[PDB]
């Protein structure tokens, strides 16, 4: 823009999930991208290159970290896919803000589900807080501006 | 007949295959690659020659 928004201030919420304030805050996400998936021809009598063609678009997954919470509902969502393989897929919304504290831009996350959950390593002789981390595969996404 | 060097050889043709790799834009082509098999010829007063047969 004339000044550009800095990145730290967002929101994310579910949708499928009872909802809890606690659940809403995190530390970081990524994997807001996308790519096209391309093949390559060569053309006799074209020498000066070759030609490409596109086949696919390709989402990578949605990665969410914060502090240890216990009691979490998005854990136990989790935990039956993980321990059952009961799935049930649900849609997020990731939310950039203003000042105001209102939406700059949107991104609508479509069919979600949990791949992974871990804590990192613990350690006796390190002041640091336990973390969590939570990796999500979906279908695509859409942003709304 | 075949000469390389030291190579000589006599016979005839088999096989070959070609196959064209770059062109110009007219379609005039510039490289092309090609495999060869040759077999081996000798004349039948030549072999018994070579073969000198000897209680006869």
Request: aromatic share 12%; net charge negative.
């Given at each position: 823009?004339?000044?550009?928004?800095?990145?730290?201030?967002?929101?994310?919420?579910?949708?499928?999930?009872?909802?809890?304030?606690?659940?809403?805050?995190?530390?970081?996400?990524?994997?807001?991208?996308?790519?096209?998936?391309?093949e390559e021809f060569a053309e006799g009598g074209?020498?000066?290159?070759?030609?490409?063609?596109?086949?696919?678009?390709?989402?990578?997954?949605?990665?969410?970290?914060?502090?240890?919470?216990?009691?979490?509902?998005?854990?136990?969502?989790?935990?039956?896919?993980?321990?059952?393989?009961?799935?049930?897929?649900?849609?997020?919304?990731?939310?950039?803000?203003?000042?105001?504290?209102?939406?700059?831009?949107?991104?609508?996350?479509?069919?979600?589900?949990?791949?992974?959950?871990?804590?990192?390593?613990?350690?006796?002789?390190?002041?640091?807080?336990?973390?969590?981390?939570?990796?999500?595969?979906?279908?695509?996404?859409?942003?709304?501006? | 007949?075949?000469?390389?060097?030291?190579?000589?050889?006599?016979?005839?043709?088999?096989?070959?295959?070609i196959e064209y790799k770059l062109?110009?834009?007219?379609?005039?082509?510039?490289?092309?690659?090609?495999?060869?098999?040759?077999?081996?010829?000798?004349?039948?007063?030549?072999?018994?020659?070579?073969?000198?047969?000897?209680?006869?």
């Amino acid at each position: 823009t004339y000044y550009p928004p800095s990145s730290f201030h967002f929101l994310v919420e579910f949708t499928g999930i009872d909802a809890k304030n606690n659940d809403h805050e995190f530390q970081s996400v990524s994997g807001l991208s996308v790519d096209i998936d391309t093949e390559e021809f060569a053309e006799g009598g074209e020498n000066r290159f070759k030609h490409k063609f596109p086949v696919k678009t390709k989402y990578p997954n949605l990665v969410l970290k914060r502090g240890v919470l216990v009691d979490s509902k998005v854990i136990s969502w989790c935990r039956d896919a993980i321990e059952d393989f009961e799935f049930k897929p649900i849609d997020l919304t990731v939310k950039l803000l203003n000042e105001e504290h209102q939406p700059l831009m949107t991104w609508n996350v479509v069919h979600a589900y949990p791949v992974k959950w871990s804590v990192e390593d613990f350690n006796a002789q390190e002041s640091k807080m336990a973390i969590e981390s939570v990796e999500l595969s979906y279908n695509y996404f859409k942003t709304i501006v | 007949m075949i000469t390389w060097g030291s190579l000589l050889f006599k016979g005839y043709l088999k096989e070959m295959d070609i196959e064209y790799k770059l062109f110009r834009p007219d379609g005039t082509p510039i490289r092309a690659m090609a495999t060869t098999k040759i077999g081996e010829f000798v004349e039948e007063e030549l072999r018994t020659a070579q073969e000198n047969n000897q209680p006869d």
